[PDB]
Design a protein around this ligand. Structure first.
Ligand code: MCF
Ligand code: MCF
Ligand code: FE
Ligand code: FE
Lengths: 409, 411
């Protein structure tokens, strides 16, 4: 049933990024009504109402791309190059995935305490699914396929794994699918995964042009990936699995597909993604990009292509923190756009845009959306024009978290 | 106990200019570093000295934070960010209110330094309100008494000379008195010359903020931009032209001095080369988070290299930062520059140790015989590879496990 919450500052997280003072929200499981808090308490004098002075009320965050299974990692993988990182992940041989549950639960709570209400979890083995189901998080689990050599047996085992994930779906868990990358998934295997997504009305995700090594491989079949398949996979393949970026992009034509990273995608490739996929969603991971390729996503190019970004943490396999607030501050440091303008992009990248990417009914304070709401408390009240930036700079731990109208924190 | 002891760790960062990394090495030290070598061989050579080895840990010099403003430690959201003019205007409009009831935040700021591995601080001070707490802290302190004043006044000079004498009388083995000229837009030329002369007469170090914003650059070079109305609007002073005709006019005042130049992101290559050739002993200080919050432009490290200079990394104050942990500042530094990460990690580490020690004329910042025994130990859950050790340390180091200052255990 219904209650009223208000704060000195409310971030609607519409595309305008509206900031409202002394506003309130009536909600049960959904957002019922928005308005001035005092007027709301007069209009509904019999409801529970709480006001949080010197606080910010905003939608719970959406973290559209993380790898919970790698939550054990601290220094198991090399940083400073993508090729060095990928080689270290493969040479690790999955050892970091063992004894996983403690780090995954710690990872889940880092999300919730950071204000994250919804997660796009990339999963290769569904080892994190149980803990996610037991958490209050909204979860879209992308079962991610790996395989550079076609095998009908591996397809059937993968479709059997996806059926197990589908049978766990409920109001908090949506099953989805992922193609790992252009260098790691053979074309006909990827086409099969994409077809299964269409047959099951599932979302799609993929890592795209994350490194110069991948760009030189995809475009000219040269560079570091020349020996990658023999050295690491014991596969006799010495040419790219896809002749050019367009060959890969076109597989996702007329789909709802998340494209992650993308820093080495030219303006031609980004425009192709928009025009071919129709419902594409660019995901940016600032800290992961700095640790691996070392190149940040060119946001001006993204704007020139007519696209927008959601900001995600990635996994601890390529990050030091799963707090989305930490990622948003790294995002502010990773781009030289005017900070006040960049703060709005960061906030929308953590709310409305991620919700649209995951096809969730949240990420914005608007009637009929889910009552996924965060309250962050501070020692002062920010000015209207500084509110968003100061929030991103100082927000560390959530003071109140409501998910589906129920108090979680 | 002024006796000697041995400490070793799986990884030791010497922080020489080579940035040497050594495995299973140890250090013998009393108040100074006495001997360096393989830890096991050190325990055989000195079997009666007290000896500890820290597995899966990093031993390195205590950090030097060459530029901070402790007096502004109360600040969280009192000042505007997103532009330098917006920030400076908000600081002035604050009217010093954030400076009142200061001691609680200053003690918290001090302790944030120590737990971050910082052993030495370059503290910029306008009123010496933080000096007392600094003195009874174990930190090595170089307090730069900073002069502000855009209109010449002999009375203001004499009161400033008198405040510096008050600071000089507090000097000891842990406190060095120094002087600072705030900025080209805030200090009248003959007032700055007087401060610089006082530093020479007292053999004091100097520090200054230089070309931190586009607004300052347009003012200094062409007497145009936001600073046109700054003196009437904020200071009630009838001044409409720059206090210095060009950057070289300001730089040349510090000719043949030991002067720290802070920020500098809007200094051209010629200006940086002028600083190097004229000052002779200049030290560039970079504050990545403050630069992002104010002007929004990062220091061009390639330009700094082209000018033949190097940088030390500092936190600035909470007036223009969210954390005074130098480790947080170093991670922000890694995010603020697109240089190859392994190469940038070496610059960051040396920027927090040896370079800052040289800037403050301190006998530390490096694990070398006869240097001060200012040593940090950071513990981890794994042993880093030799080539990843410095970067992984910067990424994962949060709180120090052991801090020794002058050979005495502090943490
Ligand atoms: C062992 S092949 C690559 C594996 O690394 C995993 N991964 C973890 N974090 C990331 C991963 N993949 C690509 N780029 C970095 C980041 O997205 C990915 O799921 C895949 O299982
Ligand atoms: C014209 S008043 C400026 C005052 O702000 C203080 N300040 C605090 N942090 C910084 C300050 N000065 C210049 N740029 C930003 C940073 O260095 C400075 O010491 C001075 O007292
Ligand atoms: Fe990923
Ligand atoms: Fe400063």
């Amino acid at each position: 049933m219904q209650e009223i919450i208000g704060a000195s500052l409310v971030f609607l997280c519409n595309e305008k990024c509206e900031v409202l003072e002394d506003y309130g929200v009536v909600f049960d499981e959904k957002i019922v009504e928005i308005g001035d808090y005092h007027n709301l308490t007069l209009k509904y004098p019999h409801l529970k109402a709480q006001f949080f002075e010197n606080s910010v009320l905003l939608p719970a965050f959406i973290n559209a791309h993380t790898h919970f299974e790698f939550s054990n990692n601290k220094a198991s993988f090399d940083y400073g190059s993508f090729s060095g990182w990928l080689g270290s992940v493969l040479n690790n041989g999955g050892a970091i995935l063992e004894n996983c549950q403690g780090a995954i639960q710690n990872a889940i709570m880092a999300q919730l305490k950071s204000g994250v209400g919804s997660v796009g979890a990339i999963s290769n083995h569904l080892i994190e699914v149980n803990l996610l189901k037991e958490s209050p998080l909204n979860a879209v689990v992308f079962l991610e396929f790996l395989g550079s050599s076609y095998s009908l047996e591996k397809l059937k085992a993968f479709e059997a794994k996806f059926k197990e994930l589908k049978d766990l779906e409920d109001q908090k868990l949506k099953a989805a699918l992922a193609v790992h990358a252009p260098y790691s998934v053979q074309k006909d295997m990827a086409l099969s995964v994409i077809q299964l997504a269409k047959d099951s009305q599932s979302l799609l995700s993929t890592h795209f042009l994350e490194s110069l090594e991948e760009l030189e491989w995809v475009e000219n079949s040269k560079g570091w990936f020349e020996n990658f398949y023999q050295r690491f996979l014991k596969e006799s393949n010495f040419t790219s699995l896809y002749e050019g970026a367009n060959d890969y992009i076109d597989m996702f034509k007329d789909t709802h597909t998340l494209f992650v990273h993308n820093q080495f995608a030219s303006l031609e490739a980004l425009k192709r993604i928009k025009s071919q996929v129709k419902n594409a969603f660019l995901i940016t991971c600032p800290f992961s990009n700095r640790l691996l390729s070392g190149k940040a996503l060119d946001l001006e190019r993204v704007r020139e292509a007519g696209l927008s970004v959601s900001v995600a943490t990635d996994g601890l396999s390529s990050n030091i923190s799963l707090s989305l607030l930490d990622e948003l501050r790294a995002f502010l440091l990773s781009h030289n756009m005017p900070l006040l303008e960049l703060a709005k992009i960061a906030l929308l990248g953590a709310t409305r845009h991620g919700a649209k990417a995951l096809a969730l009914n949240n990420g914005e304070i608007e009637t009929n959306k889910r009552a996924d709401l965060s309250v962050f408390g501070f020692n002062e009240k920010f000015t209207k024009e500084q509110a968003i930036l100061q929030f991103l700079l100082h927000a560390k731990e959530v003071e109140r978290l409501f998910l589906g109208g129920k108090r979680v924190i």
